[PDB]
């Protein structure tokens, strides 16, 4: 049961007031929405919400905010809100975002959501998203989920693909296997995961519908079938097959099931990632020797090398706006996550953990999920794309690897 633990991004970021929400009932609310909003904003690496012990007032409405009490603390916005019960057993979750700086008392954003109990965290996250986008201009990703593979020591089914919310809550098991699982990939609508399984004796590439567990067989040709990535327009799955004698890129039209070969080199070409136009891929090739990232249009033409950082680069994930990619960059016997601006070729190293691999970007481009090794096993790590915020999702029941960040949900 994963939870986020921050290592740094501590006690810094934009100061903000997030107030416990008011509760129209006896006892405590079914869920601490202000706690969620505070946690989300801090998890973004951009905000430092004031701790509960220090709140100068706990207004339960916008009208009750005293702006001067927050400007005295260099805090220019305050979140307040209310949770009320409905007769059908559902809840209303409402927030108001109140300017406490240059436009004191102005309500900058507000909303109300009707949800049942089991979707209270979801509502809290929607409130975080709106506050986040209003204050920073960047679309929120707090409603997202992550996929990942947990490997226990022993048992008949040591390998499990699982999904949880991005902050660890609401985990469920997608699939259990006696043999390794690789490389989960989300469809853009969030409804399906592609992954690789070796449970038949060799690799097979499948697409599972999450709501009902339905499985679509995509590819199990001799040798390897893996490295899936859904095109952002929903139309295609890119992947890699090595039936020809080395890994090469293919795309399948999801509607017809028709498979087309995209690369045909004698080198290995794998780990495809889509540019925003659903026509170009970045991907790993060893044609130059040590792995590097290349770029190819799926319709025709020779792949072009795009990386020159350090000695080796691979395993890339292009941002949802196409401006940058993150990748695994290897030098001096070490490998870390790096970010490359796709227009200038400039590179910034993000991480300093050990044996960094498989980076996945959040759908707003601000955060990276990836895996490293701590002691004898894999773990999950978070690092912002400016390299300043760093956290982990420590786990209880085994090694955790192969993370993939969902699209917006």
């Amino acid at each position: 049961e994963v939870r986020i633990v921050i290592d740094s991004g501590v006690d810094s970021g934009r100061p903000i007031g997030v107030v416990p929400f008011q509760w129209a009932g006896p006892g405590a609310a079914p869920e601490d929405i202000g706690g969620i909003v505070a946690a989300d904003l801090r998890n973004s690496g951009k905000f430092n919400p004031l701790d509960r012990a220090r709140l100068p007032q706990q207004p339960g409405s916008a009208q009750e905010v005293q702006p001067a009490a927050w400007s005295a603390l260099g805090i220019d916005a305050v979140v307040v809100g209310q949770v009320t019960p409905n007769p059908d057993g559902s809840y209303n979750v409402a927030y108001q975002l109140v300017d406490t700086g240059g436009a004191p008392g102005t309500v900058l954003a507000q909303n109300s959501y009707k949800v049942n109990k089991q979707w209270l965290r979801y509502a809290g996250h929607t409130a975080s998203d709106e506050v986040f986008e209003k204050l920073t201009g960047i679309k929120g990703a707090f409603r997202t989920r992550i996929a990942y593979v947990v490997q226990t020591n022993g048992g008949q089914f040591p390998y499990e693909l699982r999904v949880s919310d991005y902050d660890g809550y609401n985990q469920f098991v997608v699939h259990r296997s006696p043999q390794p699982l690789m490389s989960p990939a989300w469809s853009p609508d969030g409804s399906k995961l592609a992954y690789v399984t070796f449970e038949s004796g060799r690799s097979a590439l499948v697409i599972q519908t999450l709501a009902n567990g339905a499985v679509r067989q995509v590819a199990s040709f001799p040798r390897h079938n893996g490295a899936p990535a859904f095109s952002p327009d929903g139309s295609k799955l890119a992947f890699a097959l090595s039936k020809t004698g080395s890994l090469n890129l293919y795309v399948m039209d999801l509607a017809s099931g028709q498979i087309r070969q995209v690369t045909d080199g004698r080198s290995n070409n794998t780990e495809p990632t889509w540019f925003p136009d659903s026509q170009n891929l970045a991907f790993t090739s060893d044609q130059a020797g040590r792995p590097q990232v290349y770029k190819v249009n799926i319709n025709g033409g020779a792949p072009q090398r795009i990386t020159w950082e350090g000695s080796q680069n691979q395993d890339a994930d292009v941002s949802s706006d196409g401006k940058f990619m993150v990748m695994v960059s290897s030098n001096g016997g070490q490998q870390h996550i790096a970010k490359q601006d796709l227009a200038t070729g400039g590179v910034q190293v993000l991480s300093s953990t050990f044996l960094d691999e498989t980076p996945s970007l959040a759908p707003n481009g601000t955060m990276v999920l990836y895996s490293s090794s701590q002691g004898m096993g894999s773990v999950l790590n978070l690092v912002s794309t400016d390299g300043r915020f760093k956290a982990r999702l420590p786990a209880t029941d085994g090694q955790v690897k192969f993370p993939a960040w969902s699209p917006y949900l």
Partner: protein
């Protein structure tokens, strides 16, 4: 010991010390054309998982070519690379890595 070929970092050739061992396998398979061998190939952890499939496959393939060089039927030999997903032992130095850089001949 009798059904594993080991390899150095980014190497995939069958070196002389394994020749003898592999020949017993070829002998056996030539004799029982009913029989199918599965060559499981592997790589150590440095790298990334989908790319390191290829390092495993170069090793397994090289076993396949050698056996075919000894008269074995192509159709008696399949190859499955696990890349770095099924290490023989855990650890982060060369003792662990040399143990994990291997191709295993198994009769399924």
């Amino acid at each position: 010991q009798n059904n594993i070929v080991y390899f150095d970092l980014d190497k995939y050739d069958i070196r002389s010390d394994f020749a003898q061992m592999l020949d017993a396998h070829a002998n056996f398979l030539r004799s029982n054309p009913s029989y199918k061998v599965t060559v499981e190939g592997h790589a150590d952890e440095r790298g990334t998982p989908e790319y390191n499939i290829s390092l495993g496959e170069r090793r397994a393939n090289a076993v396949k070519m050698y056996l075919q060089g000894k008269g074995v039927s192509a159709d008696q030999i399949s190859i499955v690379s696990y890349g770095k997903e099924k290490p023989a032992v855990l650890g982060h130095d060369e003792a662990a890595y040399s143990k994990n850089r291997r191709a295993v001949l198994v009769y399924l």
